[PDB]
Design a protein around this ligand. Structure first.
Ligand SMILES: [Mg+2]
Lengths: 86, 239
RNA sequence: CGACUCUUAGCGGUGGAUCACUCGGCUCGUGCGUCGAUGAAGAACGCAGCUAGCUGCGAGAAUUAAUGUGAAUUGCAGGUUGAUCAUCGACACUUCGAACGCACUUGCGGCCCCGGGUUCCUCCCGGGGCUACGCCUGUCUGAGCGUCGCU
RNA sequence: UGUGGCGGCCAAGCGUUCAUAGCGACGUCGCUUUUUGAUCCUUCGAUGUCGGCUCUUCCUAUCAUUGUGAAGCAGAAUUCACCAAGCGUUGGAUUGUUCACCCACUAAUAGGGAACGUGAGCUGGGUUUAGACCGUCGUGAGACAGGUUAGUUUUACCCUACU
RNA sequence: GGUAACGCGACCGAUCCCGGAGAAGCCGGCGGGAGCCCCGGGGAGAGUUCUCUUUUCUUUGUGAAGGGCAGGGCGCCCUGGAAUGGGUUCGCCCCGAGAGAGGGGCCCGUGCCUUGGAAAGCGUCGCGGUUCCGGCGGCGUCCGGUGAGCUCUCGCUGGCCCUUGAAAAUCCGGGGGAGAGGGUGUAAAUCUCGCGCCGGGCCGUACCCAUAUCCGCAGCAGGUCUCCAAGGUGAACAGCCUCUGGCAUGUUGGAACAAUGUAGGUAAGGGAAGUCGGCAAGCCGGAUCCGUAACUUCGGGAUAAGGAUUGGCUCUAAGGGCUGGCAGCCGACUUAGAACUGGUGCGGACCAGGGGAAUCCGACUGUUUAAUUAAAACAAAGCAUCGCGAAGGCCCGCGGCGGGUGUUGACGCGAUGUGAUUUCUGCCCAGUGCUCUGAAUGUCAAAGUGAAGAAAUUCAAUGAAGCGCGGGUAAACGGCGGGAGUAACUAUGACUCUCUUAAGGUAGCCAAAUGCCUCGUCAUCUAAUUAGUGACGCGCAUGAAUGGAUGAACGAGAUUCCCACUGUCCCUACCUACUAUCCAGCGAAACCACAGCCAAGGGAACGGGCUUGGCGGAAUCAGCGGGGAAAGAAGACCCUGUUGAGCUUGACU
RNA sequence: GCCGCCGCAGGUGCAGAUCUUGGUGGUAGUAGCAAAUAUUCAAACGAGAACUUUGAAGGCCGAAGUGGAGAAGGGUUCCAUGUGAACAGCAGUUGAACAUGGGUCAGUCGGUCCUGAGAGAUGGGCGAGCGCCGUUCCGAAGGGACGGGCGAUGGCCUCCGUU
RNA sequence: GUUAGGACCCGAAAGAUGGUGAACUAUGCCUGGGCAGGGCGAAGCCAGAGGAAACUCUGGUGGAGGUCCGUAGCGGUCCUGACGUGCGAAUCGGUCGUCCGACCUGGGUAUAGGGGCGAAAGACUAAUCGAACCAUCUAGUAGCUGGUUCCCUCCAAAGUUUCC
RNA sequence: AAAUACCGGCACGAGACCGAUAGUCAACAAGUACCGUAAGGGAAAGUUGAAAAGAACUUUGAAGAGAGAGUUCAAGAGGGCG
RNA sequence: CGCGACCUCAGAUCAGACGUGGCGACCCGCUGAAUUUAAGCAUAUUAGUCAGCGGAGGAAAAGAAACUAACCAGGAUUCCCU
């Protein structure tokens, strides 16, 4: 009676998708995100979680500002100049 | 247990009955209020009653909750103060009343608005007064005589609802609803039937105690279970 | 004889074993060694003529204006005085999100300026600029029978 | 073969009289594993271990029946002994009972083995998981050849053998 | 306007204050109004019509929004004062603090019809468009009284609580008169009355709600939150047959009818005699009428134990409303009695009690180890004490006048020991723990004082709590002996003496859930009883709130005997269905050193393989369980490792 | 693309390890397609019908249904046309199977307003520290408003939103 | 040839650090729903009879319980039945205890690991509870088992003295 | 400030390292698909032909599936084709 | 009562400047347990150990004497060798 008859009562989900990190880690009762942390300003990270570091890296996302930071660093930080016309 | 389970459940019981705030009108004057209605408050065994006053400076219809005394009716003028007369249902200082007066809702110190002797059928008895330095010996219902600085005030009469514990409990069906209303600690389990890993008196194959139930007062938590510093035990012989 | 049990020569099936190929992994060194409220990192959602995923981009949305050079793409529709690509110093850069009016049910507030409505006389609709925390030197404003000046 | 059981030797002697019908004191020679002991050879990558129900063959250390000897066998009857396992050797009250006791009857109600015969053949009544009761001991978690009470039993369709 | 409840059409008015709805438990009974059903006649469609049948069934009206009339509740104000006590409910309660008799009046009206509204819709028959058309024309869209029938709503009244049955936004209601309005009219202000004009943002609206859309690895017998609910039989939302709606047997079809399986029944005769074990299985069964013991907490027993009856057809008698001692008209169900008669047949299928007497434990309803034990376990009604007066009792905490008890005050907060009614709870501080008291005090840290030394060092009194000291504490743990003489036949014991600690087991119960000896000794039931009941305690090791005696009714508690009946058995036999077998289609798993004709010998002391003797002659199908030390799991038993965990103590730190 | 020779170096020699991954057999065409009563004929698109269609007959569920609709949950599963790669343990023209398309419309329906159990920002204090106690608790806590006066504006500052 | 480092390879019975779970089970609070058909007549009350009084009987009304037979509904004593490589990693048949009150329960919230809950069974805590799941230390320890790969030639062993 | 450290990133070069169950787990639309209520765990996967010249034409058959032809050096390379 | 200031303490949509956080191979300051070694084990060892918190830089730390030192003396800091 602890098995198949117990799986039938399980219908009300507690965990759901978060809005900050975007993972199935938002408990509705405690109102705290299990992955990153919804009330706190800081993100929950640890050193023993070696695979959690390589799941969400900085190289996975856009780096739309970071690549133009490198592209301006390889030029030498000129500030709003114009190329020479014809 | 520490909390959140064995606490008393108080939802419909709103507020508490407090004594009137002291001022010059209770210091060297008196004032009249009316009795509106009495009602059995949930949780408390003794019923309460609405006593309507008015503020001498402001104009809001005030109200005060007091313990209902035995033999009182609604729609009655209650005076209160130092210069008030002697009748049933009258709060007044202790230095004005003579010795041998049955009072309840007594203060241990002037200012706490009534703590001592205000449960169902309880009253503290003034033994004798002392004019110098304002002292008063008052015997409590336990038996001890406390010294009170005579600055407090107390109503006259016993509390209504006397003799509630004289009749034994009729049935466990009434007892279950009564203790469910009061506090969830009614299924009292024997410590021998309890497990020895949490309760100290548990363990063993047979149902035996095997250890002295008397315990020293100087004892930490977990061990302090039983007769706490028992001087004697058994049948009370004489007094 | 036929059929069934065993061995050998030739051939067919499953398997991808051996060998070979590698725009791929592993290690070391060199010089440089930077994010962000002027809204960073991250997540979701949209953008192609036919467009699922990846890549690219943000309603200007598989990307603009400009420079070097010079006649592309392909399965099909189309055009040298600048198509393809490389460069980009100029701009755009959606919503949530350090996310900043409150909650996070996307529902509710408040201030100012414009267009219909009017003929400021106000309700309704649309657009824009605004509205968190502690702190610093200049202005602002009032508290204190603490001080004392003067009547 | 320490234990149980059996067969011979001499024959103090009992048996009214008389060692040898029936026997037997004292020692004494061999035997077996349906029993209790010792031993530790293999099995701890396991051979499902108590009894009760059904089941078959085999042995004789024979209880009766077939056929002959032998008495302290007037007849029935008692046994001592041989050939000899062909065919026979119940029911019920109690005990969980192996064991043991009683009653009625018959021809005898004789004694055993099969890896303590026997669960992919049944039964769990008691032992043999934890739950509780009473009594003793241990200060104490616990122990009582001292009990009580309820306690999950999986699969052959593969081969041989049988029909 | 009226004595008045109150009404009409708008009929002012701030700050502040007060009150109401909001916003309140459960149950029993009664009454009224609706909806769904029941019937007679009249209409539109069909079936039966070899025979009869005025037969059988479908159907017959109206929303929201305003007003009137019924009908209910009235704890709403007047004329009047009642005992020889009145009106009055299914029940009751009320009454010179104001009953009956009389007049008015508000609240709800969902029942009636009127505007909405017959125009729409439902059928029948015909006319077209071969069709596209809220098409076209005639008729109906009824006449009435009822009913403990089922459901919903409202009203009245009583009972239950040692339990008193929620808060917030919102609105108007009432005193209140500082102010706004004016000089005789077209007055000003004031408008909650009837109107007229413009809008009311955003989010979601499809399907299932279950033996194919939820969860269980899946077309998964499991779990699974709620609404609507026909006729007869019948007390019944019980069981069976039919109406509406749904369905094509749930991973397959055909064939014969082997054994052995699964589910059911029938079985001549005996009736638990088999087996630990009436385990399973079987009998009785409802209603009416008569009638009922022992013991008792007088309530239960009890349906005690026990007996008689159970159809059809056709009659008789009894119980009511309306109108004008009296007559007529409408009448809905129950009960009682009699004869005829059916093959003794009738609760004809469904529903559908086993009792009676004893022993032990627990009062019992109730919680319970999901998944081996539901019970004598626990919760338990009663009793007994311990601490504490907020400067504290207890618990939690790392911390902040930290929180809980506490929204609380000895009839209170925590803690135990036992635990329905009735009697007792004895003796003992020897020991271990608890409490009280102090300088008469052996002992006594740190720090302070004084003395010696050139200084680090050394010495002395004082020496806190606690220990020791004196008392109580046995509803704290626990404990409560042994040996001899002895009374007129003997057997056996009253009585007496000694050793010894804290007095040495008090009264009851008893070979018990408690006695090794022991299957202890006696009556009993039986052919027999290691079984049960009734006895004496002398008890390895019984014993008085770690409890004992007693105990009415009961326990899915553990045992004994007798009725009742049965294939449990004697002792086996027969039938049906689902099975199993063959054919079409599809199509696993376990196991696998290799294979499976034997006996003796030896072996790591029980082999299919070694040796010697018997034998072995294609290939498959339905059974069977003897073997493959049949598969399982580096044994769940025991021991060891200088291997780990939990409980517990005065082991060690 | 590779071999020998002279020196050097190794992740350099497999039969097992209840060795790892992958592949394939005896088993084996074996066991099996049995929880809940029931189907039978005519024609039909189609090559093809024990399972699909309509027409007829016979039944079951018996209002606590094998009925109609909801909530959680599922997320195009609803419908139309075409298809015949895989599934519906054989079967299929059919189906919740595949591909193209349609399909959910609110001033009057629920959320939106509020509080209950409870959570929690913040005064304050604690804490090396991300942070902790508390919901009034040690606080400079009403940014609202009826009226009177004074300068100014929009419409002849008349009266109102005005400032 | 030997020692230390992972040191021929693999292997537990456990310890610490940090996060996550009361959707199954268990206790509360708030807001709500449901629970046929019948027996027994406990209390209030009326009339009559007897009696000097006190008071006692008879015939009706009426509905009370930790009430019963029993539906819905809550769990499954026995047969150790069917299945037991199941429909099913705990189902079904006969069969019951209870069913106006210590009745079951729909949603939101509180309580999390030497801790919580617990009408008290080391009982339960997501198919896992004599101390939950995942990652790290960790390749933790192992006087102990299991295995450890070409050829040819020559030499050729001990199950012991003493110690812990 | 000076010589000191760099395992991540921005640009490269080199190697007595490995070669599709090896090498980063991932040589390809890899922390991707997928599982768990969650902290978390975590795969399988290269070799057509130099060139698609990818088979026109006849027949069986409803289509699936065959039998002859064509390309090329060879189908001895037949759409999962060293 | 009335008039002007010094000190303590006040609110911002006052003009204008800051911090919040993702990541972090190297570094700075703090807390910093046991598996194990000691064939057992507690002193010791593992071990200023993993992990946790705060923070900026291309480096940080770091730096000129209340120094080494008994020599016939040297004289800011840093890394390597003996
Ligand atoms: Mg017998």
């Amino acid at each position: 009676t602890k098995g198949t008859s117990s799986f039938g009562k399980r219908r009300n989900k507690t965990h759901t998708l978060c809005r900050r990190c975007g993972s199935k880690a938002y408990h509705l009762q405690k109102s705290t995100c299990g992955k990153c942390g919804y009330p706190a300003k800081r993100k929950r990270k640890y050193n023993w979680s070696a695979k959690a570091k390589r799941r969400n890296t900085t190289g996975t996302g856009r780096m739309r500002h970071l690549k133009i930071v490198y592209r301006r660093f390889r030029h030498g930080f000129r500030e709003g100049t114009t190329p020479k016309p014809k | 247990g520490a909390g959140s389970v064995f606490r008393a459940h108080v939802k419909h019981r709103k507020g508490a009955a407090r004594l009137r705030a002291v001022d010059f009108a209770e210091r060297h004057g008196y004032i009249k209020g009316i009795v509106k209605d009495i009602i059995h408050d949930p949780g408390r065994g003794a019923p309460l009653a609405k006593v309507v006053f008015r503020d001498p400076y402001r104009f809001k219809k005030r109200t005060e909750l007091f313990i209902a005394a035995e033999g009182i009716h609604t729609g009655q003028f209650v005076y209160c103060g130092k210069k008030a007369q002697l009748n049933i249902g009258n709060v007044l200082p202790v230095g004005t009343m003579p010795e041998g007066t049955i009072v309840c809702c007594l203060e241990e110190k002037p200012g706490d608005r009534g703590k001592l002797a205000r449960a169902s059928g309880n009253y503290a008895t003034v033994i004798s007064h002392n004019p110098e330095t304002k002292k008063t010996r008052v015997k409590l219902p336990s038996g001890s005589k406390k010294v009170i600085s005579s600055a407090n005030r107390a109503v006259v009469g016993v509390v209504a609802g006397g003799g509630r514990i004289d009749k034994p409990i009729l049935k466990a069906g009434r007892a279950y609803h009564k203790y469910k209303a009061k506090r969830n600690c009614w299924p009292r389990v024997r410590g021998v039937a309890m497990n020895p890993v949490e309760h100290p008196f548990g363990g063993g194959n047979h149902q035996h105690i095997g250890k002295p139930s008397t315990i020293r007062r100087d004892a930490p938590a977990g061990r302090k279970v039983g007769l706490i510093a028992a001087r004697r035990t058994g049948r009370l012989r004489g007094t």
